[PDB]
């Protein structure tokens, strides 16, 4: 807890600056970018789009993103390093497993999984020597038996290293409650855990029950909305029909309840996206042309106009991410 | 149909020699070997075990294997090339999709998939320039909607290039019938298709219905048996309780019915195996210490002793694979 691992090495806590805690360079599948780069036009075109996007984000004040792409999201840490160097934006990489693990992962024990997460945190990802600074896990409703092993192994890895855990939920099923019970049964401190996609729900009794016990709350999909996309079912099912304003007002709600130190904010944006319908990226880019700059350009001014102070917003976008990311057992 | 693509380039039909048509260097998942080589001891240990295994196979008469590992079996063509060069055994690589495609594949159209298979056949796998010489597909019972797209795209790729298709079935559900109907609805010639795992069933009415219409029959798992593995459920569910002799006698049955030109024989062996329970490889290696040499060392003498001629066996192990692998629309 003097240093956070990024794809270009250790940085100090003050270097992190304004940090987006849930993003993706590319939302894909393991091996997919190497096997089928033309899906994205080309590898070089994906690089360029990401570099330009991160440069716009940097010009709006962003200094670091946490790329929460796992193995099964097709995380390519060389791609991340390349993009990070060209855009002059720090990128923290992730270990863990999301919702699409292949058989070679799904057949593993809790102990085996813990070894895998530990490898990626303590030694390096693949042969790159790049180390993950965060562990990403997932459920979508009631955990499957394998997802329970994942959550346990994430807890064990976090307990050995101090690196935080961040989660994918189906927020309407209140999955944070089950995630929390499993993490706690392994002895993990809630202050090392972000329950993500929590802006997908308006249930304050769920959000406050998590925050009351010490969890960080990931209000991480603020520009996800299909409002005013006429007759696009696939975009609707992915993005929802709640407005970005509704999502953003959750940030204010939690501040008003005393939880300003526990809120993490992000876009959950990407520059490529192969794990859904073809051309989702173009649909998403039309909905939110600011991409990752959407938080500083649109959300911050919206909240200031609703009465949230500049100091409070800086605490949420700079202090909370540094405190979350800094390795420790108890933050 | 003067040349077959291998992981070290084109070879002529007579160079193929005695060919095992359904094998694996490593049965894994995309990205898995690169991310977690220690699962296999090490990458170098996997290489060594495979080299020694293929050397024993070569000393028993094998000259070529067809590695039917796809993308989602974690096919690593550089690993295959390395092993092939050190063992002096030709390896044909595969494209297609088996039973574990990730989301980035499962969301694709028939046209998109056809482009992907065509890439791997006509251009190269990843950035290696190595081209697949066969297309591998799979069902396990009634095809899912995505598996139907896979089978169609395999047919389309085969129709453009002449490269054959080979299949995984759940033979007890007679999946070959549905596979055949889909391939035929795309216009594919049965003489370009091997219906694999066909030695998993004793149903002659199923096997002959496929052979009668021109399909090749993959009797490809001959040493798979859990007989005399006391109380090992996982090995039993994978390997079955029919003896290798029972499987091998299917070769004789089809010869006796007039189908000697349509039989392809293999072990469906591997040197690493991460997509099942931990230590399956050790269990499998104790059941069949000859590995890929099991066909020439054990099956061939068994069939000669039951009255099959040497010439017939050479036609099955040399001529049928050359005729199957040689690119053409109608073999
Ligand atoms: C103490 C919380 C506060 C009044 C500070 C400024 C941001 C909005 C709420
Ligand atoms: C014509 C088929 C045959 C009598 C030849 C030798 C192998 C066994 C059957
Ligand atoms: Zn998610
Ligand atoms: Zn507690
Ligand atoms: Zn939603
Ligand atoms: Zn995400
Ligand atoms: Zn199979
Ligand atoms: Zn026909
Ligand atoms: Zn069986
Ligand atoms: Zn196989």
From Swiss-Prot, chains A, B:
Keyword Ligase attached: no
Keyword Magnesium (UniProt): no
Cysteine-cysteine disulfides: none
Post-translational modification: Predicted to be exported by the Tat system. The position of the signal peptide cleavage has been experimentally proven.
Annotated GO biological process: catabolic process
Positions of post-translational N6-carboxylysine modification: 136
Cofactor detail note: Binds 2 Zn(2+) ions per subunit.
Cofactor field: Zn(2+)
Practical use: Has attracted interest because of its potential use in the detoxification of chemical waste and warfare agents and its ability to degrade agricultural pesticides such as parathion.
Annotated InterPro entries: AryldialkylPase_Zn-BS (IPR017947), Metal_Hydrolase (IPR032466), Phosphotriesterase (IPR001559), TAT_signal (IPR006311)
Binding site for Zn(2+) 1: 22, 24, 136, 268
Binding-site list for Zn(2+) 2: 136, 168, 197
Catalytic activity, as annotated: An aryl dialkyl phosphate + H2O = dialkyl phosphate + an aryl alcohol
Membrane topology value: Peripheral membrane protein
Gene Ontology terms for molecular function: aryldialkylphosphatase activity; zinc ion binding
A Pfam family recorded for this sequence: PTE
EC number(s) reported in the record: 3.1.8.1
GO cellular component terms given for this protein: plasma membrane
Location relative to the cell: Cell membrane
Assigned keywords, A-Z: Cell membrane, Hydrolase, Membrane, Metal-binding, Plasmid, Signal, Zinc
Protein family (similarity comment): Belongs to the metallo-dependent hydrolases superfamily. Phosphotriesterase family.
Function in brief: Has an unusual substrate specificity for synthetic organophosphate triesters and phosphorofluoridates. All of the phosphate triesters found to be substrates are synthetic compounds. The identity of any naturally occurring substrate for the enzyme is unknown. Has no detectable activity with phosphate monoesters or diesters and no activity as an esterase or protease. It catalyzes the hydrolysis of the insecticide paraoxon at a rate approaching the diffusion limit and thus appears to be optimally evolved for utilizing this synthetic substrate.
Known partners and oligomeric status: Homodimer.
Protein name (record): Parathion hydrolase
Species of the source: Brevundimonas diminuta
Lineage of origin: Bacteria, Pseudomonadati, Pseudomonadota, Alphaproteobacteria, Caulobacterales
